[PDB]
Amino acid sequence: PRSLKKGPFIDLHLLKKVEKAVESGDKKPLRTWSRRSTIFPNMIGLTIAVHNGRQHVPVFVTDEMVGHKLGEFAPTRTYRGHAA
Amino acid sequence: ARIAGINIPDHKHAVIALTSIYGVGKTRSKAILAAAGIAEDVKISELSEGQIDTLRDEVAKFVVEGDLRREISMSIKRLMDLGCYRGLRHRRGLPVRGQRTKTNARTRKGPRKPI
Amino acid sequence: MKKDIHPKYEEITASCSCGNVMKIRSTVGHDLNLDVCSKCHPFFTGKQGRVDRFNKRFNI
Amino acid sequence: AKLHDYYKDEVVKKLMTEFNYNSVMQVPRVEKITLNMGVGEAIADKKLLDNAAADLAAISGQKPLITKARKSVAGFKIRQGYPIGCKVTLRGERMWEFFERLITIAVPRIRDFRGLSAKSFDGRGNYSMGVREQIIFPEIDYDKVDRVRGLDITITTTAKSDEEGRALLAAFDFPFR
RNA sequence: AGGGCUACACACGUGCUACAAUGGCGCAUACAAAGAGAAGCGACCUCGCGAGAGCAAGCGGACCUCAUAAAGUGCGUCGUAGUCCGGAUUGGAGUCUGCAACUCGACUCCAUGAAGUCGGAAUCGCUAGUAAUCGUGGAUCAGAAUGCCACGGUGAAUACGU
RNA sequence: GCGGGGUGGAGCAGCCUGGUAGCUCGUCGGGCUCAUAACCCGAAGGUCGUCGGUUCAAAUCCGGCCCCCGCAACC
RNA sequence: CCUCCUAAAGAGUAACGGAGGAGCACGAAGGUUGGCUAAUCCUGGUCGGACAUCAGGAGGUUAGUGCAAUGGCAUAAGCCA
Ligand SMILES: [Mg+2]
Ligand SMILES: [Mg+2]
Ligand SMILES: [Mg+2]
Ligand SMILES: [Mg+2]
Ligand SMILES: [Mg+2]
Ligand SMILES: [Mg+2]
Ligand SMILES: [Mg+2]
Ligand SMILES: [Mg+2]
Ligand SMILES: [Mg+2]
Ligand SMILES: [Mg+2]
Ligand SMILES: [Mg+2]
Ligand SMILES: [Mg+2]
Ligand SMILES: [Mg+2]
Ligand SMILES: [Mg+2]
Ligand SMILES: [Mg+2]
Ligand SMILES: [Mg+2]
Ligand SMILES: [Mg+2]
Ligand SMILES: [Zn+2]
């Protein structure tokens, strides 16, 4: 993982969008591309759309996901099992 | 003989015997026998009950078999329910740390299920 | 009770680590020594996450 | 006679004030403890029932009654008259002396004990439980554990409800969760 | 910009690690060859269990660093067990590279300890400093070797004959 | 009317005497050959035509029936 | 040869009428004395599940009877010694 000495990564556009969305309540989904953003304690309650290559996922942020990256909640590969 | 609610082999050394309280390997074994001052080479056949309960006190300073089992299952349940990539990867009984799944990855997948 | 079939039932000393020394009858024939007891157990006396560790490890 | 005198000296008085019963006769008693063992894998191993019963005597201090199949069953491959288990009925002094050890020595030695369930009163206050390993009792020589067998404990009582049975059983320090 | 070439019922080639005792683990201890380095090799010293961190010398190098060679040796134990074998997988806590380790990085520590107990049909390589085994370095390259390329140490077996 | 048999994809042993499913060819996986066939090594596939009854238990026994069938039908 | 129906409330009563069984078993499965009471489900229970054994409730013969059916059977003729 990212070494602690640097602090948790976050993308500027993501952070400023959640910021001015924080101060304005739970508005529309904040369609994001930065699947590499780490989740922050203030996003609890946010619904943010994340990219899987072609789509955006309606991912409601809970307390329990804090600390992890955003991209772990939008599967990029679609596999419904072999020989279906 | 009875350490952390379980039994340890009476015919083995101390280092080796303590490798059976699920949650302590060799390093923690040397650490117990340092914090308690028993030579690593002695077989617990040759202890006294007081040495044995001192062994119990020094192991009591960690998360062990019941603690470790259920706390681990709690972490994997957090993963299960998070729906994160590790969530899907444990729901799937697939590998979870990005190893190749075109080839063997069999420790997870088990034996072969030919088509 | 019938004779000739039941085990030998007599009283030995179940010694615990805590200083809990109780007399029971038992089919062991020899003394007991215990690691846990009704008054030295974790449960019998009361010995029995992401924002938190975040703030513990990540300062902004 | 330890926990029996504990009943006659503390528990009758506690439950005479909890429920304010008319007389002592209305206070629940612990009337028998039944220890059973299903040894159904003894279809081809008759030595198995007569070894797993050799442990129930050591646990109980008392020779058990080999129990037989009531009916024919092609499901689990048995026949009426085939003995597929063993039980002991404990009463009086030896019941109390078994019960006290069950409290003080036996349940402490269970792998990952988290508190006995309170969901095992059958509507009339009687408590059964499982013991998934015969080495929580020390009378077994752990060096001659020739198999890992369990047993059901059943504790019957004059308690009339689940509530009264969990109460009577709670003036006796049963570790409910 | 993100995602994919890193998927996954399966089948195949190519190698690695083992299944142990001619070996594993603790201790000390010996003899290489070759080769790289300036947006670099980076010692001493201090700090962290460790990967590494800090500050800070030398070197465009038969001078400085890379960089303690492992096998081996001796001492102790293990005493044939799914084991003081095996190290997959998995959880937690980590370091570092680069904007950036979710998909999808490389190493650390702790915990876990899976198959595996010498491999069906078949099939490959080698006639000597060879196979076999044991470590070393280089190119690529911010990081990312069980591959390739290159280097030594030990060191065999057997060849009637066609 | 009397009397048969039905069992993995195909063809048949297993039944009489209730337990303890087989052979041969086929299918799939891998070998061998330049490739195919032959040849070699593994493996998977039937709880027995529907079903009632009796039973400890049914492919086996009985029968309502179902398919395929054979001998009888005369003065 | 046995049981039931036809068979018309005593007995008996036919048809190539409607339905089933027997050609045994048991030295205990006979005698006697003492004792005992089923099916089924429900709740709780280590394994263990629709279904094993344990414990308790509901239920009251829906069980059981060495083998058909009918009549009987608790004072049991059923179950154990
Ligand atoms: Mg990878
Ligand atoms: Mg590719
Ligand atoms: Mg050079
Ligand atoms: Mg390099
Ligand atoms: Mg190992
Ligand atoms: Mg480790
Ligand atoms: Mg194995
Ligand atoms: Mg072995
Ligand atoms: Mg090498
Ligand atoms: Mg690199
Ligand atoms: Mg004519
Ligand atoms: Mg008449
Ligand atoms: Mg008349
Ligand atoms: Mg007449
Ligand atoms: Mg007839
Ligand atoms: Mg009588
Ligand atoms: Mg009689
Ligand atoms: Zn105690």
In whole angstroms, F61 C1' to D50 CA is: 39
C40 annotated as ligand-binding = no
**B98: its two tokens:** 């990005």
| Inter-residue contact D21 to D15 (CB < 8 Å) | yes
| Inter-residue contact D138 to B92 (CB < 8 Å) | no
Chain A: give the shortest CA distance to residue C53, in Å.
Answer: 9
Q: Which of residues 131-170 of D touch strand G (CB under 7 A)?
A: 131-132, 149-152, 154, 156
| CATH number for D82 | 3.30.1440.10
User: Residues B19, B25, B27, B28: is their CA dihedral positive or negative?
Assistant: negative
Domain count, chain D: 1
In whole angstroms, E160 C1' to B101 CA is: 54
In whole angstroms, E121 C1' to B92 CA is: 36
CATH code of the region B2-65: 1.10.8.50
A 10 A CB-CB count for B77 gives: 12
Q: Rounded to whole angstroms, how far apart are CA atoms D12 and C5?
A: 36
Task: Say if the Cβ atoms of A4 and C57 lie within 8 Å.
Answer: yes
- Compute, in angstroms, the gap from residue A52 CA to the centroid of ligand 12: 93
**How is residue A38 annotated by DSSP?**
B
Q: Which of residues 22-51 of B touch strand E (CB under 7 A)?
A: 22-29, 41
Cα of B61 vs its chain's centroid, Å: 15
| Inter-residue contact D137 to C28 (CB < 8 Å) | no
| Partner chains of B (3+ C-beta pairs under 8 Å) | A, C, D
Tell me which residue of A54, A3, A46 sits closest to A26, measured CA to CA.
Answer: A46
Distances (CA, A) of B112 to A79, B89, B92, B104, B106: 19, 19, 16, 9, 8
Structural method: cryo-EM
**D171: its two tokens:** 């003036």
Contact flag, residue B66 CB and nucleic strand E, below 7 A: no
Q: Rounded to whole angstroms, how far apart are CA atoms B46 and D152?
A: 38
- Whole domain around residue A55: which residue ranges? 2-82
Domain count, chain A: 1
D177 in any annotated domain = no
**How is residue D59 annotated by DSSP?**
H
Residue B108: burial class (beta carbons within 10 Å; 0-12, 13-18, 19+): middle
- Compute, in angstroms, the gap from residue C40 CA to the centroid of ligand 10: 57
Contact flag, residue D98 CB and nucleic strand G, below 7 A: no
